[PDB]
Design a binder for this molecule. Structure first.
Ligand SMILES: CC(C)C[C@H](CC(=O)NO)C(=O)N[C@H](C(=O)N[C@@H](C)C(=O)NCCN)C(C)(C)C
Ligand SMILES: [Zn+2]
Length: 254
């Protein structure tokens, strides 16, 4: 690994929802939560041997934390990821998660072109227990800004983004749970797809340590494998990490 290029710098954004409900309406409380979360998530990444050998030391660090203290005032018909109402159903507490990710990508496109990854932290109750979403490892996107011209948006947007909500079923999720969501979404950004039941090695039984972080069904984090990447995820991220490090990875600060 190139110690000069082993860290994916992040642009972390907290919308007014997160600021109010998670940060208690205080910058200090909001940034502290995020700084500590990314650090724990980083511990997972830095310590992972993508090649089960010496290809490790790769992780994430926050470059900028943007805090949107109040909803984004918009003109009728116009939408923004930080606006007060949910879209498309203003009656629901949350946006359709997919449309929200696209909107976030559209709105922070300018800032996203200057970073390895952009991650939105919000506080809205997504339907059917969904906690987050991200580009990369699908059916393109992920680490390092890749342009995509949006016909509807009339500009280039970048697919190096993801989001995490710390609210599910009417309550704030446990910090141990939030860590898992971000690790999983960032996992997608790093190229990992979900672990398939078809490969036991990548989706063990509860008596074998449980499932790994990229399993599609949320894992409380009370089982051993829960906060680790399976061999399937490792292989994917390993392939991705190589062709990408030189492109946008930087040197770890500290
Ligand atoms: C951290 C997890 C892995 C993220 C995924 C979504 C995903 O794959 N993001 O990239 C999720 O929220 N999964 C939900 C989940 O497991 N949520 C749990 C809390 C749930 O609703 N469990 C009860 C089922 N009614 C689904 C969509 C499966 C309901
Ligand atoms: Zn997923």
């Amino acid at each position: 690994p190139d110690p000069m290029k082993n860290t994916c710098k992040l642009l972390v954004v907290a919308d007014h929802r997160f600021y109010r409900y998670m940060g208690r309406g205080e910058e200090s409380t909001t940034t502290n939560y995020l700084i500590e979360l990314i650090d724990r998530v980083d511990d997972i990444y830095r310590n992972t041997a993508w090649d089960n050998a010496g290809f490790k030391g790769y992780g994430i660090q926050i470059e900028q934390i943007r805090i949107l203290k109040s909803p984004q005032e918009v003109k009728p018909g116009e939408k923004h990821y930080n606006m007060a109402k949910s879209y498309p159903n203003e009656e629901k507490d949350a946006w359709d998660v997919k449309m929200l990710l696209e909107q976030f990508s559209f709105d922070i496109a300018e800032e996203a072109s200057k970073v390895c990854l952009a991650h939105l932290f919000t506080y809205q109750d997504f339907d059917m227990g969904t906690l987050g979403l991200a580009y990369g490892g699908s059916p393109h996107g992920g680490v390092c800004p890749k342009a995509y011209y949006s016909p509807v948006g009339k500009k280039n947007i970048y697919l190096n983004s993801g989001l995490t909500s710390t609210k599910n079923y009417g309550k704030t999720i446990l910090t141990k749970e939030a860590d898992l969501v971000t690790t999983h979404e960032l996992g997608h950004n790093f190229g990992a797809e979900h672990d398939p039941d078809g490969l036991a090695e990548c989706a063990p039984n509860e008596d074998q340590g449980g499932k790994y972080v990229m399993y599609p069904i949320a894992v409380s984090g009370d089982h051993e494998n829960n906060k680790m990447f399976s061999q399937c995820s490792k292989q994917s991220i390993y392939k991705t990490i190589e062709s990408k490090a030189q492109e946008c990875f930087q040197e770890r600060s500290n």
